[PDB]
Amino acid sequence: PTNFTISVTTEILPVSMTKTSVDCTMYICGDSTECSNLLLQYGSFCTQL
Amino acid sequence: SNFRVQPTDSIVRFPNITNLCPFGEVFNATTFASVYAWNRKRISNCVAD
Ligand SMILES: *[C@@H]1O[C@H](CO)[C@@H](O[C@@H]2O[C@H](CO)[C@@H](O[C@@H]3O[C@H](CO)[C@@H](O)[C@H](O)[C@@H]3O)[C@H](O)[C@H]2NC(C)=O)[C@H](O)[C@H]1NC(C)=O
Ligand SMILES: *[C@@H]1O[C@H](CO)[C@@H](O)[C@H](O)[C@H]1NC(C)=O
């Protein structure tokens, strides 16, 4: 080669996503007392989430 | 989670119906109907006691 060129290029990368939290009783029962008292003889499927 | 609020009162709202249902004109009713030509009747505006 006898001459050259300067080239500027672009690269795009994800770094992070959104952070969420879920309330187990409010999603399942929803301020019911008949429910959320039946959802107490089920196991620990709400701390593990 | 939510453990801090408990519902206290309980309210009931029903429409203003006063006359009782005709249980006694469809329950003694000197002559009934044959099974093959059974009788159908509509009931409306009742306090079904
Ligand atoms: C290596 O390549 C570069 C281009 O990347 C050459 O530079 C260029 O030189 C030419 C001739 O001198 C320039 O043309 C001129 O254009 C202007 C109008 O823009 C005009 O008024 C002048 O009379 C002439 O025609 C050209 O623009 C210029 N490019 C850049 C970006 O500067 C360079 O000469 C090459 N070198 C070798 C060793 O071949
Ligand atoms: C049948 O029901 C009507 C409605 O209350 C009543 O007036 C009538 O005395 C009843 N007849 C008998 C035999 O019970």
> How many residues comprise chain B?
49
Judged by a CB distance cut-off of 8 A, whether residue A25 touches chain B is yes
Please name every residue paired with B47 in a beta bridge, in sequence order, or none if there are none.
Answer: B20
Please name every residue paired with B20 in a beta bridge, in sequence order, or none if there are none.
Answer: B47
B9 lines ligand 2 (CB under 6 A): no
d(CA A46, CA A23) in angstroms, rounded, equals: 8
Q: Which experimental method was this entry solved with?
A: cryo-EM
d(CA B17, CA B46) in angstroms, rounded, equals: 7
Burial of B32 (0-12, 13-18, 19+ CB in 10 A): exposed
**Residues of chain B contacting A33 with CB distance shorter than 8 Å:** 7
- CA distances to B1, B7, B30 from B4, in Å: 9, 10, 61
d(CA A29, CA A26) in angstroms, rounded, equals: 6
d(CA B38, CA B43) in angstroms, rounded, equals: 16
- How many cross-chain Cβ pairs, A to B, lie less than 8 Å apart? 7
B28 lines ligand 2 (CB under 6 A): yes
Resolution in units of Å: 3.1
Find all residues with CB under 8 Å of B41, minimum gap 6, and list them.
B26
